[PDB]
């Protein structure tokens, strides 16, 4: 919606800088917010999922580790 | 005056037709002996004198089969990705460093 | 001389061509001899008529497919000796010759 | 007169073997009653839309028997199977006839 | 002992349910058996997780739910659920 | 058996390329495809010994194969679950 612009130009670069990127196309920033999003909605709904499991209706950072570990990437010091 | 040429099918022709058979078959490529032998080798230095089940091999073969065919579709999308239709060893290189295991 | 399944070269057009004589015909007796024993003409067999009154040969071309196999007498066939050998050398300088011969007509042609 | 669960909960895959194998399996400290009737009710239904595509394939390569060549194309035309399966090699399927259109003649 | 255990019968009804006509290989029924013995232990896992995340003891048909939601994918998911609860709601109502 | 690797003549490494979909094949591939082998089975082979040899067996079993793909992510159907 309007947050999905908020994921800015200098950012997405910041993302390629980390990333060892040197030249970017003027094309990559609106299909990369996409591939964000897709990326985004698919965790999200693993871990919403195990949200309403649990009778909660606020979603953790352990239902977030949890939901990655579904999808397969794990992430540390965010609870698990 | 008018001297013969043969029937030659042109480059590619041949190589499309035999693409479009292939990829109707299911019958393994790779044959089964020179194939169950390929395993007894390797399977030496893990331990000696194994035996192996009726259907072990047959199941490693079409399984490195599958894998294979696998590979070159993402192979063959990497030669385009290039321009190219010849495929390179810096093709499978690739795959298999974006599948996580150069 | 001829013998069954021996190298032999033959006509074909202005040029020689080496061929295997899979079947030897003979005209008085109206049959030929083939190798894997006299046997006639079968039903879909057939030699043309300028040679049959002539000694055939069944002759496969090398280098090419069964779809050239054809019937040759000794018009068309000749031993495989060092002088047919040089004769098609000759004759395939001959064509060289003409394949030369068509360059420089289109490289004329080109210009 | 004993009358089965599976005719208690109209399917034809069988309650009685698959509580005994999520018993088992120990997937839990306590099984309930009713989550091997919904296994089974959520494994006949993927049984099924397979064997479904499966048919329609066998109809259009215009056999009476399914072969996997048959399963293959069920799964692989399917692009919801396609990630819930294309992590799945099967026996004896081949690929799907594709060529890229670079590769095509002009 | 000899007795091997194995869902040949049940998916040829299930088949025959859905087409009274067709046959079946032998191998090809292998694929379907190892493909619904997949699919259960990827379900009924996803499950057990649930269960030990949620602090609980019992698979209620309530995981097996989040879990078949949360493993296939969303359009053969929405259809299994509702295959699956009319199934145990037939199976309450038969008691 | 030693180098039994060029069993699959290259012949065959070019029919599961053709299965693969691709045109043209260049000369050095054959040895590094047979590599994506020998090391992809040699890991596979790893896992069913580890399997065979752990569950006290002298054979090499087609269900310690399966089981070996189940664990890598290269799993295998048609042969039990």
Redesign the interface.
Known sequence: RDNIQGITKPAIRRLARRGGVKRISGLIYEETRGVLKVFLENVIR?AV??T???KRKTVTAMDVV?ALK?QGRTLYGFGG | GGVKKPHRYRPGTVALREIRRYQKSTELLIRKLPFQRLVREIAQDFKTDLRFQSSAVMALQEASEAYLVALFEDTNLAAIHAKRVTIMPKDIQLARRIRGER | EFALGGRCLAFHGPLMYEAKILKIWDPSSKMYTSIPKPQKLGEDESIPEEIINGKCFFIHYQGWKSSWDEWVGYDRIRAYNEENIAMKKRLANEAKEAKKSLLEQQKKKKL | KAKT?SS???????VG??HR??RK?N?????????P????????????????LA?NA?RDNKK?????R??QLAVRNDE??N???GR?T???GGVLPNIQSVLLPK | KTRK?S?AI??Y???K???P?????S??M????????????R??????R?????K???????????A???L?????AK??VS??????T???S??
């Open positions: 693993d999922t195990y309403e499991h649990a949890y579904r | 669960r208690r909960a109209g399917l034809q895959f069988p073997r698959v194998l999520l399996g997937y839990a400290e306590r099984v309930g009653a009713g989550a009737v919904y296994l089974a009710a959520v494994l006949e239904y993927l049984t099924a839309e397979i064997l479904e048919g066998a009476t028997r399914i072969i996997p048959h399963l919801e199977l990630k819930l399966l799945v099967i026996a004896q | 255990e869902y049940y998916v009804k299930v088949l349910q859905v087409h006509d067709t046959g079946i290989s191998k090809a292998s694929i379907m058996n190892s493909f619904v013995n997949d699919v259960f232990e379900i009924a896992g996803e499950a057990s649930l269960a030990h995340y949620n609980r003891s019992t698979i209620t048909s309530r995981e097996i739910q989040t078949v939601r949360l296939l994918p969303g359009e053969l259809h299994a295959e699956g609860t009319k199934a145990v037939k199976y309450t038969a008691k």
